């Protein structure tokens, strides 16, 4: 006789894996300048 009907479609595959973690962020900008130095010492007395 003729061949029978075609079989059913297979099961859907499972999901793929997560992507890689993103790259680290860029380095931050440089810090601010420090505070000014203290006032100089008073001159010695004459």
């Amino acid at each position: 006789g003729p061949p029978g009907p075609p079989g059913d479609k297979g099961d859907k595959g499972p999901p793929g894996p997560p992507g890689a973690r993103g790259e680290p962020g860029n380095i931050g900008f440089p810090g601010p300048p420090g505070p000014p130095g203290d006032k100089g010492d008073k001159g010695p007395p004459g």
Binding site: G13, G19, G22, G25, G37
Partner: protein, 46 residues
Amino acid sequence: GPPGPKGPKGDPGDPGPPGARGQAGVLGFPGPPGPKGPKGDPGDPG
């Protein structure tokens, strides 16, 4: 003649592709402040 029996089921599908790589991390924050500046020069002698 009668048709034959139904064919076999298809094979399971393949796993999916990996997800996209993650986004880049946040930029770092600004660096530490610099040191205190040099002390002033002393005053003149009296």
